Amino acid sequence: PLESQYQVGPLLGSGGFGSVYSGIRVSDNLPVAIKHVEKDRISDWGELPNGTRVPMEVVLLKKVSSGFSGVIRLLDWFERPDSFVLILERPEPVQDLFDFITERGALQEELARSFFWQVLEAVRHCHNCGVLHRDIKDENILIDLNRGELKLIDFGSGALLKDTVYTDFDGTRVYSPPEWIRYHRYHGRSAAVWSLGILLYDMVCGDIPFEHDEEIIRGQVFFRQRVSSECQHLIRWCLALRPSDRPTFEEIQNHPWMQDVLLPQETAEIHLH
Ligand SMILES: Cc1n[nH]c2ccc(-c3cncc(OC[C@@H](N)Cc4c[nH]c5ccccc45)c3)cc12
């Protein structure tokens, strides 16, 4: 009985991911998000440890959902005749990174450093749990405005982490690496790093660097806003045309621009409150 266990609120959004409603856990008034996904619209199917056919996101969220708060938590899930229903964490107040950047324009590098660091930690946590997100972008990052903490959402395009090639991609085109565009194949970590490069650019420039496939393939980064030489270098490094020329997570976090990051709470008090 999910209809009586959660008090359904307003529809927050809908699209290829399905339909996401605002919710309240009747048990303790905990703010939740209720996600509906039709079985026909499900591309990747997964298997629970107890052996049960289920949406891949459920499998992935289970592997990542622990104490760490850089990833959104799967609280529960139900199966309906023609759909699955996911119950998720909901911060409040909240705003995603896309709306935040849209509203504020390009971010100050101190703020972008904090946000980007937190994303890196979240992505690093996912890969540790054997999970690849495959659609890292502002729109899939929630900001806990009160705590200054960022959270990864939407693992519906994700996959089990592996060391061999991926030949399928269902993330956003303009966030996809040139090797996907050219060869329809990529590797997990190097492709994630590319999208992280796209993400960082968007934070400090207020917009995406590449619009068309030809721009992605060319890999020429033009900066439309004032950005420090350190940050430009890190961005151009993440956006190296050859995957093996891109930095590891460790190299990104050891980068000179990545130093002296603010704490999430400091971030909130300075940039959010
Ligand atoms: C608002 C919220 N709180 N917790 C969660 C968890 C998961 C989602 C979520 C799940 N699946 C897909 C999602 O899509 C995010 C974007 N790709 C699309 C989007 C843009 N604006 C909204 C508003 C509400 C839902 C989705 C989107 C998010 C949202 C929330």
Side-chain angles (χ1 to χ4, degrees), residues 1-72 74-273:
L2 108 95
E3 303 84 18
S4 59
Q5 192 166 355
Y6 301 93
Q7 201 47 254
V8 184
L11 177 80
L12 296 184
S14 71
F17 52 90
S19 299
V20 179
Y21 295 83
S22 178
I24 290 295
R25 185 161 68 183
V26 183
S27 315
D28 63 333
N29 285 6
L30 183 81
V32 299
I34 306 180
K35 184 180 176 179
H36 299 257
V37 41
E38 298 193 34
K39 289 184 180 178
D40 313 274
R41 194 158 42 188
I42 298 179
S43 51
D44 268 28
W45 286 86
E47 290 257 353
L48 269 335
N50 51 89
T52 308
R53 198 169 160 90
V54 108
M56 180 61 59
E57 184 174 21
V58 180
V59 174
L60 299 176
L61 282 175
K62 275 264 188 56
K63 295 174 78 69
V64 297
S65 319
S66 3
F68 184 66
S69 69
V71 180
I72 206 74
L74 178 66
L75 301 172
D76 203 21
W77 68 270
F78 307 86
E79 179 177 358
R80 248 106 91 108
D82 300 282
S83 72
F84 283 86
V85 177
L86 305 197
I87 310 302
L88 297 132
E89 246 201 304
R90 182 172 51 96
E92 179 62 28
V94 76
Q95 180 181 43
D96 66 27
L97 187 50
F98 176 80
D99 292 332
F100 184 84
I101 291 176
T102 301
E103 178 177 340
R104 191 173 296 228
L107 303 190
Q108 300 177 15
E109 294 196 16
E110 184 189 64
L111 175 55
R113 174 180 304 111
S114 179
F115 281 4
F116 191 66
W117 181 270
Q118 296 194 37
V119 174
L120 280 161
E121 289 285 315
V123 178
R124 188 135 77 87
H125 167 78
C126 289
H127 293 203
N128 265 98
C129 299
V131 175
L132 196 72
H133 187 283
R134 300 163 100 202
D135 195 24
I136 300 160
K137 57 178 177 182
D138 50 8
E139 202 186 56
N140 289 331
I141 294 163
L142 295 185
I143 304 175
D144 190 333
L145 293 171
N146 281 347
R147 297 190 178 276
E149 296 171 7
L150 268 52
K151 298 177 176 298
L152 248 47
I153 62 175
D154 187 18
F155 285 78
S157 289
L160 265 36
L161 180 59
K162 65 180 181 186
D163 293 322
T164 60
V165 286
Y166 294 88
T167 52
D168 73 292
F169 178 78
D170 221 271
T172 353
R173 187 80 174 170
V174 292
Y175 274 82
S176 65
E179 60 271 22
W180 166 254
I181 306 296
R182 291 184 53 86
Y183 311 121
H184 279 329
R185 35 195 295 151
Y186 61 96
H187 292 260
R189 295 183 176 272
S190 61
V193 165
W194 171 274
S195 71
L196 289 167
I198 302 294
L199 170 73
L200 180 51
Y201 183 95
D202 184 72
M203 291 188 190
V204 297
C205 287
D207 206 347
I208 233 61
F210 308 130
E211 236 278 292
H212 301 94
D213 292 344
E214 24 276 314
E215 295 180 315
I216 303 179
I217 288 179
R218 181 159 181 252
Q220 266 299 120
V221 182
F222 165 85
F223 286 86
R224 67 187 82 196
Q225 293 289 314
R226 166 63 201 197
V227 179
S228 69
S229 297
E230 336 275 338
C231 187
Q232 285 200 17
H233 176 271
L234 179 52
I235 288 175
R236 283 188 235 264
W237 195 6
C238 291
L239 296 174
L241 284 183
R242 173 175 298 259
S244 62
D245 289 340
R246 295 171 197 155
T248 60
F249 294 144
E250 182 180 12
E251 286 177 311
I252 296 177
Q253 295 194 294
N254 281 332
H255 192 277
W257 184 78
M258 212 74 259
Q259 294 315 304
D260 304 316
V261 67
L262 299 177
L263 305 172
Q265 195 55 65
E266 289 178 347
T267 301
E269 284 172 333
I270 295 174
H271 297 283
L272 265 38
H273 296 175

